[PDB]
Design a protein around this nucleic acid. Structure first.
Ligand SMILES: C[C@H](CCC(=O)NCCC[N+](C)(C)C[C@H](O)CS(=O)(=O)O)[C@H]1CC[C@H]2[C@@H]3[C@H](O)C[C@@H]4C[C@H](O)CC[C@]4(C)[C@H]3C[C@H](O)[C@]12C
Ligand SMILES: C[C@H](CCC(=O)NCCC[N+](C)(C)C[C@H](O)CS(=O)(=O)O)[C@H]1CC[C@H]2[C@@H]3[C@H](O)C[C@@H]4C[C@H](O)CC[C@]4(C)[C@H]3C[C@H](O)[C@]12C
Ligand code: 118
Ligand code: 118
Lengths: 268, 268
DNA sequence: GACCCTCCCCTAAGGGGAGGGTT
DNA sequence: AACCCTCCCCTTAGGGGAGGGTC
C-alpha cells in the first residue's frame, strides 16, 4: 500500500498524509531509502481512524498529537468541551444579531445606527449629579461646571482620549426635571469642591451606537438601543451613558456632531 | 489624531489599523507624505464603529468591504445567516459527541473504539443474500462464492481499494436465523446467474468503528455504535454494513484481524 | 501512463519583531 | 524615550503547482 492506495483507503488527500507524516502524527510504516516512498500498513489505517475521529470533534492538530499518545490526558477534552459551549453561545448570539439586522433592513432601506459591544475600562471621573429642566439647559450648564473644576484643582489633567460623558439615572422616559449626572474622565483623584465630587466609574460591557447629527434627535438612537436590548435578550445593567466626541466645541457645523451612546449591558 | 491616539480611541491595536489601511477597508483621512504618519478624523471612527459592528456578526473582512462599499447587499447578510445556522448545527453535534466521549473515557480507562462519521460512496457490488445458521459458518461459505463468480464472470476485477462487506438486513437481534447479504465491490456489471446478483449500493454517510481482534467479540462494537446512535440523536437510515479489512486472507494471528462496522445514519 | 518525491508559496486576520526615521 | 514607518517572518490544516524522479 503506497501513499496513493492508502489515501484512497482512508478517503484522505495525499497532501494530508504528507502533512501528517511531516508533523509527526501518523508516521508511515516504511520509508524506502532509495526513493523516499511512503508505505502504509493497516495499523496506520486504525490510527488514522481515531485521528479523523478526533478531528471531527474540533480538536486542533496540536491537541491530537497530545491525545493520540498521552492516554491519560482527559482534561484537554473537558477544555474543548467548555470551548464548544462558549462557541455555541457566541454563535447563538451572532444569529440573534443577524436576524435583528435583517429585520431592521427589511423595515427601512438605510441602516441608520449600528450597535457594537465593547469593553469600557474603569476610569477616574469627576462628576456632578443634578436635576435639569431640559436638555438644552443641561448643555448650557456643562461648560461653567468644567471651568470651576479646572480652576479649583491646579494640575488637573484630562485623560487621553477625552472620555467625557453623561449618565441618565432615570428609569422611565423623563422629558423634564431629569436626574442627570455629568462626568469627565481625568488622570487621577482630585478634591471635592462644591456639589462636584470625584468617583471611580466601573468597567462595563456596553452596547454602543454612534449618533452623528444634532442633539434634539438623539431620542431615536436611544430607542434603537432599547429595541436592540429587547430583541437580543441582553439586559441594561446600569444607567445609560452618553459620550460626547464631536460637537459645538470641536466642529462649528451643527450637522457634524458625533456622540457615542453606550448602554451598559449584560447578557441574560 | 495620530495613529496612537486614534488606536486608543477605537481600542484596537496598531497593527490592526495598519492592516485595515493595507486592504483599503479603513483608510486614514490624511497621510503625511514624507513621514508616512497616519492621521485619522472623527469620520474614521464613525467608520471603524461600523466595521466592528459588522465584524461582531462574524462577517469575514472581504464581506465587510462589500457590506460597507456595496449597497442593497442583504444577500450577504442572508448568506452569513445560513452559514451561522449551519455552524450552530455542527457545533451542537460536536458538543454532543464530546459529551459522549467524556461519558465513555470517564467510565473506562481505555477507549476501545472511536467513532468516525465518514462518507461512503455508492458502489457496484455482487451480492448474495441468504439465511445463516451460525455466524462462524457464515465465514466459511463465502470463498465458494468467490470461486464461482470469478468462474462465471471472466475478467471481473475487484475494486481497488477492496470493499468487501456484509449488509445485515435484520431489523432485530437474533443468533441463529441471521438474514445477511454478502456484498463485494467490483468495477463493472456482470452476469447474475444464481442467488448471487449484481447491484448498486447507494452512497451513505455512516458512523464507523474499527474493531481489532477475533470476530466473536464483534457484537461489542455493534452495541457501542447503537449507544452512539442513540446518544447523539442520529437515526439509523439503512441496514448496518460490516467491512472486512484484515482476516484469514492476510494474516495468521487471530489478534491482528480488522473489521470496520458502519452504521448508515442521518442527523435528525 | 501512473504514480511519487521535495520544495516553494498560498490561505485570514493580524502578531511579533527588526531596522531606521523624527523630535 | 516616544511614536511612527516599512519589511519579513509567523500563526491552521493543508491546497496547488513545478521540476524531477520512480514503478
Ligand atoms: C431608554 C432609557 C431608559 C429606559 C429604561 C430612557 C430613560 C430616560 C430617557 C432619557 C431621558 O428621558 C432624558 C432625555 C429625554 C430626551 O427626550 C431623549 C433623550 C433622553 C436622554 C432620554 C433617552 C431615553 O429615552 C432614556 C435614556
Ligand atoms: C443493531 C442492529 C439492528 C439495528 C442489530 C440487528 C441485527 C443484529 C446483528 C445480527 O443479529 C447478526 C450478528 C449477531 C451477533 O450476535 C452480533 C453481531 C450481529 C451482526 C448483530 C449486530 C447487531 O445487533 C444487529 C446488526
Ligand atoms: C469640562 C467639561 C466639559 C467640557 Sb466640553 C469637551 C471637550 C473635549 C471633549 C469632549 C467634551 C467644551 C465646551 C466648550 C468649550 C470647550 C470645551 C462639552 C461641551 C458640551 C457638552 C458636553 C461637553 C470640557 C471640560
Ligand atoms: C471473493 C470472495 C471472497 C473473498 Sb475474502 C477478502 C475480502 C476482502 C479483502 C481481502 C480478502 C478471502 C478469504 C480467504 C482467503 C482469501 C480471500 C472473505 C471471505 C469471507 C468473509 C469475508 C471476506 C475474496 C474474493
Amino acid at each position: 500500500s503506497q501513499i496513493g492506495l492508502f489515501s484512497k483507503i482512508c478517503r484522505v488527500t495525499i497532501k494530508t498524509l504528507h502533512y501528517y507524516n511531516k508533523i509527526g502524527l501518523l508516521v508511515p510504516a516504511y520509508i524506502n531509502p532509495d526513493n523516499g516512498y511512503r508505505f502504509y500498513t493497516s495499523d496506520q489505517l486504525m490510527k488514522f481512524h481515531q485521528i479523523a475521529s478526533l478531528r471531527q470533534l474540533g480538536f486542533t492538530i496540536t491537541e491530537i498529537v497530545t491525545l493520540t499518545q498521552d492516554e491519560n490526558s482527559c482534561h484537554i477534552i473537558e477544555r474543548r468541551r467548555l470551548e464548544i459551549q462558549k462557541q455555541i453561545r457566541d454563535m447563538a448570539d451572532m444569529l440573534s444579531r443577524i436576524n435583528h439586522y435583517l429585520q431592521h433592513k427589511k423595515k427601512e432601506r438605510i441602516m441608520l445606527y449600528q450597535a457594537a459591544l465593547k469593553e469600557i475600562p474603569e476610569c477616574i471621573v469627576y462628576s456632578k449629579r443634578f436635576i435639569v429642566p431640559d436638555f438644552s439647559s443641561y448643555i448650557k450648564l456643562i461648560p461653567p461646571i468644567g471651568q470651576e473644576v479646572m480652576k479649583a484643582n491646579p494640575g488637573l489633567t484630562l485623560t487621553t482620549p477625552a472620555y467625557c460623558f453623561t449618565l441618565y439615572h432615570d428609569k422611565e422616559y423623563k422629558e423634564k426635571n431629569m436626574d442627570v449626572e455629568f462626568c469627565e474622565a481625568v488622570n487621577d483623584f482630585g478634591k471635592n469642591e462644591g456639589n462636584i465630587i470625584f468617583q471611580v466609574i466601573p468597567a462595563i460591557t456596553a452596547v454602543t451606537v454612534i449618533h452623528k447629527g444634532p442633539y434634539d434627535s438623539l431620542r431615536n438612537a436611544y430607542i434603537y438601543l432599547m429595541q436592540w436590548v429587547e430583541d437580543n435578550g441582553y439586559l441594561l445593567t446600569n444607567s445609560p451613558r452618553e459620550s460626547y466626541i464631536d460637537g459645538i466645541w470641536n466642529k462649528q457645523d451643527s450637522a457634524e456632531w458625533m456622540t457615542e451612546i453606550q448602554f451598559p449591558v449584560e447578557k441574560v
